[PDB]
User: Fold Solute carrier family 22 member 12 from Homo sapiens.
Amino acid sequence: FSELLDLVGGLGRFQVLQTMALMVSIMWLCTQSMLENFSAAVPSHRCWAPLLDNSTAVSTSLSPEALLAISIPPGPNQRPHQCRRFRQPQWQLLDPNATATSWSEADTEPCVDGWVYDRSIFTSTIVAKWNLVCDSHALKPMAQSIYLAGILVGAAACGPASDRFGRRLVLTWSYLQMAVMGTAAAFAPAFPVYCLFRFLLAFAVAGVMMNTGTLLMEWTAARARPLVMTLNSLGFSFGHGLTAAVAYGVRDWTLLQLVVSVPFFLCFLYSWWLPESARWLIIKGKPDQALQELRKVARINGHKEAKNLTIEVLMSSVKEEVASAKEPRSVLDLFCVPGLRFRTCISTLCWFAFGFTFFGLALDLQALGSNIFLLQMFIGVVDIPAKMGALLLLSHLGRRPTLAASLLLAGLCILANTLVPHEMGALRSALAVLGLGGVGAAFTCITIYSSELFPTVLRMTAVGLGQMAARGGAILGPLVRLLGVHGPWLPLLVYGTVPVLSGLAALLLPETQSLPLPDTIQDVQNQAV
Ligand SMILES: O=c1[nH]c(=O)c2[nH]c(=O)[nH]c2[nH]1
Assistant:
């Protein structure tokens, strides 16, 4: 196929514009994913109580601190209780000589009259709206789980659909669905409906995530392919800074969700100017349209010599590739073909390790300071140089050793954190930073490597199974944190051993530097032969 890119232009005006345009969309998609930290923030809260919240109440010489103490009991947070109030105002407790033994817990009652929330940081959040607190607190992480499950199912659906119906088509309608469902989620009347809309938004997030990178890779020259995929991966790094910047300005969750959703109507509108993947079209047996896509890209690059391409030349270039594609395929053929099965197992294991570890490390970084927006920005600032380094290594060393080294570094940082006491807080901070660097670089290596390992006929099915595994790991992540009751080291041991073990397993995967992309399963067998 590459001769056609050499005629059309494998790097130039078109690829420059395309990479820029798709990277920006990935930035906004990253905001959509990370929005939970600001849309669903838990502000400090207490029960509503007469002496504090009845604005008609009579004045006294008491201070607000004393008035609060008279009404809300002290709680386990070494601060006023968040879920109880006194059944009768405790005038006996105004005396500073009084003791906690003076009142029974039967003298308290739950927040029957509702909650009061702190507005000093956020004007409103879904937590403050639907009272996802106290006995209902489990609903706040349920939303994150439902979003991640939405991405899991969306990958499962969009992979085969992308291989069957095209790259750009599914990308376009994924953009539309993201816009519509994010806008709908911003105006949800009730929590179940909010969960439904977030789920349907994630279902499309999966399609954008998958199609953008593959569509970039299938239109780019060999030497530029790692750089282009690295820029697409840096879209997320800038998306973290963008999330911090936007969430700093907009403090209402409805307005914030709407603001991060509206851009996707523009993404939908400008996606129609993109070409469909000509490589895929040829391999599907549709050269008559692939010619139009190719001369479209030639026209963008400025090549007036596009007349050199006709169906004659295209077919004479690609007939022996196309002759193999007579039979239909399925995800089942990733597991009942000799060569593809092992690549599948090890690739899926690496994707699972990435997803399983990343969302734990991203929150481990939250101990590094007291400002939530700054600590969101740092997730990107830590990631930018890590992915530049990943590009340098992946250029000079190849895919296999770079992936192995990155995942091993992540897992070894996690495991090293078990041996360092909090007295050495500087060291624990350094190791957390290195862990985030390792997983961020491993994401780049995974994205590039698992696209080269699989043929064009089934590339997106494979990438979709990888995404499924990643989101399954992300969902399992929080559950592993429950093990800490047996010992605080155990969750860290488990978080660390998976990336170490998968990084070691990556060493068994075949190298792909300086090879053509495979286009048919026969190519995967031929490579082994
Ligand atoms: O470097 C990344 N940061 C993320 O926040 C993220 N989320 C995701 O699904 N893939 C990635 N990659």
Summary: The two ends are 21 Å apart (CA to CA).
